[model samples]
Every structure is written in C-alpha cells, then in structure tokens.
Target: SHMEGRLVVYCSATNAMCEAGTKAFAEKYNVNTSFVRNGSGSTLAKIDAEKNNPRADVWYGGTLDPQSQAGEMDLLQAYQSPELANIMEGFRDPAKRKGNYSSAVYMGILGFGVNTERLAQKGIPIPRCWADLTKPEYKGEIQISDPQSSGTAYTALATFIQLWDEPTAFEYFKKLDKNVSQYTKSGVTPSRNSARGEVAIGIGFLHDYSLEQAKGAPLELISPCEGTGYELGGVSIIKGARNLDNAKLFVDWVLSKEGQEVAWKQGDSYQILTNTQAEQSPNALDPKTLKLINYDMETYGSSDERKRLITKWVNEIKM
Candidate 1:
C-alpha cells in the first residue's frame, strides 16, 4: 500500500477516450490521476521493468491479451473487486475475476477501418470478410499496426491463429501483408489514417472505426463474415501503488453506474460496459448481435508463448 499522493494509469485507449475516462474519474473522486498512453505491449514492458519497484498505480483500457499477460507473469495484483459481480458474463474472465487481481471491463470487436470514399473512387468494393483483405486489389492500400507493438494488432494475430492452422494463417497474413501500405506503429493509427483517406483500409478495432465515424471521419466498420476477434478492455490496480485508497475508490467508481456512464456520454467509445446499471450507448457493440469466437485469454496471455508467436510472425510473416 505504498501508493499515495499520486496515481498513474498506463492506458492504451485512444487519447480522446482516455482523456474522457480519466477526467471523469479524477473529478468524481477528487484524486490526482495521470496516465501515459501506449499499447498493451508497452504497458506490459513497463510492468516488467517496474516489477520490483513499481511506479504505476493502475493499468487500464488495453485489450485483455496484455492484461492476461500481466496476470500470467504475476505482475498483476490478484484481488477481486466486489463490483465485478454486476458485469456482463461475456466480458467477465472465465475465472470470475481476472486471476483474482483484475477485471475485464468491456468488449470491443475487431475489424477493418474502411474509407468509403476512397473505396468508391478506386472502384473497389468494401471488404466483407477477413479473406477480402488479402485480395490482390488491396495490395499496398491496407494498413495494419505491427503486432509486436500493438495489443490491437496482437489481437488480430491471435484471431487468425484461432481461425486456422499455422500454415494457413501464415499464408493469409503474408497475403494480407502485401496489401498493407505499412505496418503502423499503433493499432488505432490505422483508423486515423483511414479517416484521413491516407489508406483505403486500416485493420484494427471495429469499435474504434465507429468512434472515428461518430467524430465525422469518412470511415465505416465492417465485421468479417468468417467471424472476427474482439477485445476486453481491462483494469487493474498496481500491486504497490502509492495511492492505494484512491486507486481502490477509483476502481470501484469505474465499475459503478456513474463511471461507465461517462464513457457512454463522450465519443461513445462503445465497448460493452462492465456494470449492469451503466448506460450502454445504442452504439456500443452488442454481444448478441455479432458473430464471435471463443477467445482463449490464458493461452495467448502466456508471456513466453506470446513472445514466441509474435517473434515467429515477425520473422516468418511480417519481415
């Protein structure tokens, strides 16, 4: 319980969304909270580096894969929040709480960010499935962030691994790679890039694409027909947080009606809320409405295995 005057949130959420969530939480609790934004991979690295003398008071808003990575490595503090009971079952960890240390807060679908205007101009049909992205017409016009650096990208990789055999998935990725204009550094960057019409398509979160579109970006989201992957944005209090009391209050508040409602108000970030009474935007991804796969948080969450898989991709497919 070293956590005191300050609280640090390691966030991978979009700047706009993170700002909204953090500001709402801080103002409500009257606590000082600050965050550094990065993908889940970067946040996990920070946790690994600070395992002995930890600085981060909380880690939030990245995909479940990295959260599970922390849980697997013992970087996560395994304490269940009583507030977790009100959360939807689909978003909850199979173990009730995340390793008894964290909680899954929301669910988000994965898909391509499409530039409707650009596709029309190029006479290319909007992509409808995962395989459509690998079409020859899309070569050098697709954008996907590197999985090594992005939790979003890693989710995409994990999806394919679940979708088919290793060789088949690798072949699909190689074909998709050819279409990629470049492997962007951040998973959400593709959304911004596609919004600006810089690329015909960006492969990332379908929800983020909706976020961009709601902001008036010329983009649309397409859920793949063969099925798609999704993310469960997670939250955990840092084990040695200086501001332990405030952090706990903040966590409790976030899983409360008020906190989840804030996310619903601004930008309509659209992940499935963890709390029952939390107002869900009509825009939020409805679990019942979409085709989903059984995502294995434990297998993909293993640090050594994740590294090995991502590294294999880097050499055999990405490079």
Candidate 2:
C-alpha cells in the first residue's frame, strides 16, 4: 500500500536543486514523489493558506525565519530528526532539539554579489563592506529580493535589526533602498541578475551567488567589512501531511549526509553543508573570519514580530 501511494513535496528551493533533491529523496524512499519550487514567501503563504486542507506532505528549503514563522503558527510537525546528530549545535533548532518542530538542513552566509567586469568598466572599485552599498554611485545598481516576497530578503532585513538598533538600522536600510534598482520576488533571481550583468550587485546568499559565478557570471562575493548575516535553510513536515509516513521518510533522507550531498553535487546551491562530513564550496566565505551579527532567531522569528518588521520595512521602502 505504501509503495503504491504518491507523495507531494513543495519547496522554495531553486529549480535545479528542487529537481535533483526531489528525485534523490524519492528514489531513496522508493516512493513516487513530486514537488513545486517557488519563492520562499509564496511557499510559506501557501502552507498557511492550506493549513486545514493541506495539499503538500512536506515543505523544504528556505531561510530559517520563514520556517520559524511557520513554527510560531504551529503549522509544522514536531519531530527531532535522527540525522540531527550530524549537525552542529548552532544549526539545530533549540526547541526542536528537545523534540519540537522542523530543523535546519543546511546553512549559508548572506553577502554582496558583484559583477567585477561591470565594476571595472565603470572604474568603480570592489565593494567590501555594507556601508559601501549605500554609496551614491552604487545607487540604482543593486538588486535585492523583496522581503515580502522572499525569505532571504527577510533574513537580510532581520540582520539589520540585530546589527543596529531600530532608528540607526532603519536609516541605513532607507539608504540601501535608495541604492536598490529592483526587488524581485525570488531570492535566486538577484544572483542571476548580477551574474548576467543586469545589475552589478545582488544582496543575497553565498550559495546562490556562487552557483552563478560557477556558471561563469563574472560574479565575485564580498563579505561585508563591518559584519554580516547568514541563514540555516530548513525543512519541515506539514502538521497533517497527506502522506505522513512518506513525508517523514523524506525529511529523514534530506537531513542525512547522502541526501545533502546533492546540494553540493548538483551545482545549484552552495551552503556550508549542515552535515559536518559534507563539504562546502571551495569559494564559500569563511564564517570564522567575518564578524557575524548576533541573530536572535527565536525572537524576531515570531509571527507577530516578523509580520511587524516586514510590514514596517515594506512601508519604509514604499513597496
């Protein structure tokens, strides 16, 4: 009966990773699995909208904020994945480590993506700090995903809150907004836009940007001089999954070392690899050397707070 049944997976991962991860997980479980990959914001909205008549069995691949926001709403099934033993203490959900909701599958840093060729042609120097982003010349040259439409962008928004107090950070955010050319719906789109020279800079993840650079996009990563932010890409089972057993199987497989290998091998993503045994991209930024801000996942990640901040930011940018 289990073998004959189908399983549905909904992901906010990029298309390439979504296809490879979906296929790898399905093949491992010997189950027929399908998935829909879209922007993280859209995925979270869908899960919330379908809470009662939940369509998908699992939600996979997005920043921790959205996953935590989902947890705050109690839409996720709480289960301590056995594979969690391989993950670092920082990567595991503190509540979930005590047998609570979903957990992180991988982690990546947030930073600037630059089109070196474009920058050189303009006679502008490489940017190495967050302050450099707000410079006038860089104005209308930056591409960031809309926080309302992207979990990565939300993480960047949340990062500012931790990096600076409300007033100070809000002022800087406004300046950055002035520099921003557009806010796309998908997180990975900014990386592609920068790599393709549509814009010289993209404020996004090291993994997404690296994927484009690997594709020969002339993309160069910049770890902000002052300090920066990062994310723990997460996966969770729906509270009342259409196929609970298979969803559990899928979760187990993804958190496993083998399941995580595809993220690296597929060339679609470049996280630091949650599994200690798994390797990070050679070009990845070193978290140790950089001054990472103290991101309070439990606090800002709450539904009311996340909603408030995102709403305030949307109004701030007039988006």
Candidate 3:
C-alpha cells in the first residue's frame, strides 16, 4: 500500500476523539494523519490565519457555527460527498448546510451535568432548569466554557438570545457568571469538571456527561425545563488544502459507519451521529427526548454576529 499525502485536520472534538478519528483514517487510507486539537472558536481563527496557505486539510467535530462562519468567509471547499445521503433530512438540506461547504457528523444538545455526590455533600439542590441555576444556592457551584473560546458556550449564548430578547440574554449571562467558578477553554471540559467533582454543576452538551457516567463519574444530566440548544458537529474540506484529494476521501469515509464508529470505541465520545446506519452510543442522551429550542443558525453563525457577541462577552460578562 502506498503512503499517500498527509491528512491534517483542525479538530474540535476532544483530543481523544481527534486522535481516534485520525488514527482510523490513517489506517484505512494507508496515509499519515495529523491534527491540531482546539476549541471550535480557536480553530476557526487558526483556519482564517492560514487561509492564504492552508495547512489543515479538513475541519472535524465541532459545532457547525464556526464552520458556517468559515463557509461565509470562503475558507471551506465543497465536496458534497455521496455520504451525505446517509445523513438525516434535517442535516441534508443544502439551504441550511452552509451551501454544501459542511455537513453534520453528529448533533450535541446543551444541558447540565450535576456531580450528584458533590451537590449532596454541599446540600445544594440539583438545578433542573435555566431558572434554577440563578438561585443563590448555586453561587460558585457551576462551571461552563467561555463563549469567546468555545463553540459550545456560544450555542448556549445564542440559545438565550433566541429564548429572550438580546438584552435579556446578556443579563442572564451576567447572573450566571456569579455562579460560574471557572470558564473553561474547552466546551466539553465542564462535563469533565463535574465528573471530577470540581463543580456541583457543569453546563455543556449532555452527551458528554454520558461518557463521564460510563467512566463511573457520579453525574446526572439535566435538560433545562426551558428549551435548550443543540449543535451540528460539522465536517468539511479546507479551501486550499495541501492534500485536497485525501481530504475529500476523508469526508466520505467519516460519514460512513466505518468512520463514525471509531469515536465511541476509542475516545468514549457519545454524540448522536448523523449517519442513519451508524450504530448509536449505548449511553442514551438522545436529543429527540429533550426540549430543544429552534436555534437560528444563519444569523447567529454569521461572522459578524459571533464577533459582536464574543466581544460583548469579553467586555461585560467576562469582566
């Protein structure tokens, strides 16, 4: 077998997932594989910085918002893989899929993960909804990623705005910040934080909590009584990829059962996969059962809006 061109990915999936996926790709294609793992927000900035001379061949496993922003900036190339047929109808529409620049590999729902033992030790009642966390009992008992650095956190921010007026959304963050002990850099880390008993409650994709539970972390998931947000985990080819041919092959393979199955086996990632035939995680955090809000991907995923909102977070809530 020939050792083909290197396949480089800018991955926002946990480094565990990124390593698993890349290693699987390398083995299947008989090529070298490499990746840079970072939060979705940081990866987007890196992609933009390298636009004129692209380094990574693909973007994998992050909320689609950054990929949407990349699509608008002409940073991604459209392959429109036949594998798209395996995806669900909601993710198949070109009208909403950044015009073929990206597609959902999976979708993750926003929710809470409570460290059951920790909360019980502190006598803090478990928070079950968006409104419950604001209570004085939860002060300094929560952790969430910073929106400026994480796509997951940005989804939560956008969800609040969609749930209420813009001013009201900012106000909500301000109140929530008083309870937040640490604003993590990785969206998935808040779940890990809860699993480690570092916080009573962690706000992130509930699917992540399932992975923690499987590891014997005493955590329980909470889908806010108010509707929550969800993210399409985007996979796309880079615009000027050095290994363009290899990148397209990856797009096809990644959306296949052979590809989607790698994460659960190696990385313990449990998001609801996009490929209809791909067997799902046993850790049951299905989005269909949750109360999800209608997230406006277009307006909020746009570059202008992300910059504006993140800037506001840095200046106000982060202060």
Candidate 4:
C-alpha cells in the first residue's frame, strides 16, 4: 500500500544527498521516489505556489526556520513519529503536532568557510569573528547569500539581532556589506565559491565547507569566536499531499537511525545527524564545544519577522 506509490520530495540539502536519499528509499520500499534540489527559501516558495495542487509529498533537508514558517502558514500537517522519542529534545519542535511544525533531521553550525591560500595571496589575515569581515583587508572578498532567499543568511541576520540591539545589528550589517563582493541566492554558494578560490571567505553552514574540504578543495571551516548560530535541518509532509500514506512513511523512515545514516553515505554532507544512534561525521562540530548564541526560533523563524527583516535588509543595506 504505502510502498506502491510514487513519492515526490522537495529537498534542500546537497544534490548528492537528495539522490542518495531517494535512491535508498526506492530500494528499501519499492516506491518510486524523486526529489528536486534547491535552497530552503526557494523550495518553500515553490511549495506555497503549488499549495492548491500539492506537487510534492514531502519537504526535506531545509533549515528549520522555513519549515516553521510553512507550518505557521498551515502548509504542513503534523505527524509526530514515534522515532522522535529517540531524538534530542532540543532538536524537536516542542509544538510539532500543535502549532509549531516539522521534525529535526540534522543540525549544522553557522560559520565562515575560509580559503587559506586565497587569503594569504591577498595578504589578508585569517578572520576570527564576525566583526573581522568588516576589516579593510577583507574588502570585496567575502561572499554570503541574500537573506531574502537564503535561510543561512537569515540565521546570520537573526544572530546579529539576538546579540545586539536592532539599530546596532543593522549597522554591523552595513559595515559587513562593505566587504561582501556578491550576495548569492543559495545558502551554500558562498562555500562553493570559497572552495574554488573565487573568494577568500564564505559565510555559510560549517558542514558545507567541510564537504568541500573533504573533496580536497583547500578550505577551512571556522566557528566564529564571538559565538555562532546553528540551524536544525527539518523534514516535513506537505499538507493535502496526494500520497499521504507514502508521505507519512517517508517521514518515519527519515527519522529512524537507519535513514539518518543516509546523509553520511552521500559522502558530501557532514551535518550532525539528529538520531542518537546515527553515526556523526568527524568533520561535524560538536554542539557542546561551540559558543553558540541562544537563537529564538519562534521570533526569528516567524514569517512576518522574516519578511520585515528582508525588507529592511534590501532597502537599508542591499543597495
């Protein structure tokens, strides 16, 4: 029954992870599964556009904020898996079946992806904190995604606000903007750019830089010294999904220890898997060691707050 239908997924992680996940699901359940890879913000827009017709059965591997926004919009139907019992409490949305939505699949720390060779060539010293990006030496050398369309950038924005007053945070962003060469659309693009030596540094999730380094891309991952932010990558079922049975089955499988291990099998993803039984990648930063900011998911993850911040960022700083 559940194993008999086609399952469509809007996945926001690396393309390799998407392919590996769908392929693994297909082999295990005899279900024809396919996924479209894109950034979390882009994927969420598509899901919103197709809400009436519901194109995908599940949304997977995006930053938790967009998933929470989708849930607030009533785009997701809650289905709390029994497997959630094994996941860490901090990772699970407390209101999963109530108001808040989505379950954690993995977690990743926010940091800089530095190209050591490129920085040395430019005579730029290594950056140790967020403020270092504002230095004159880093001018026109850093890359970060646009907050309007990237959850990674949104997290960075929220981190600033949480750490400082609104006006002060905006000022910080203005200073950082002086050094940013371009604002890419996808969250991981900056990391990709740094790996190719296109930029001296990239602001993105640490795991992305680790993936590039694993491929011998001459990159170093940095957890900001003044404290950093992290995102819980989430998995959710689309509301009014055509294949509800298959969607639930997919969520359950993804939450299990076996499904969580699929990330490592892809070789390019190193986000800390949520399942305690799942093996963590050595490249993944241990959450316990980092000086992480206490990010308020409810406030920053809200659709209204996200829109307001993006609007302000565009008008005040994006120019």
Collision count for each candidate, in order: 10, 0, 0, 0
- Model 2 worst lDDT run, 10 consecutive residues: 91-100
Question: In lDDT terms, how accurate is model 2?
Answer: 0.81
What are the per-residue Cα lDDT tens digits for candidate 2 across 30-92? 789899987777888999999999999888887777777787788888877788888877776
Q: List the residue pairs that clash in candidate 4.
A: none
* Best of the two (1, 3) by TM-score: 3
Candidate 1 segments whose C-alpha is farther than 4 A from its true place: 1-4, 94-98
Better of 1 and 4 by lDDT: 4
Better of 2 and 4 by lDDT: 4
lDDT of 1 by residue, 13-80 (tens): 77766788888877766667898898878888888899899888788787877777777777777656
Candidate 3 lDDT, 1-319, residue by residue in tens: 4688788899999888899999989988888888989999889989999988888999998888888888888888888888888888877642234567987788788888999899899888888888888899999889999887799999999989887879999998889989899999989988888899988899999888988888899999888898898888888898989999999999898888889888787777888888899988887477778788877878887888988999998899997
RMSD of each: 2.6, 1.9, 1.6, 1.9
Q: What is the alpha-carbon RMSD of candidate 1 to the true structure?
A: 2.6
TM-score of each: 0.93, 0.94, 0.96, 0.96
Give lDDT per model, in order.
0.79, 0.81, 0.86, 0.85
Q: Higher-lDDT candidate among 1 and 3?
A: 3
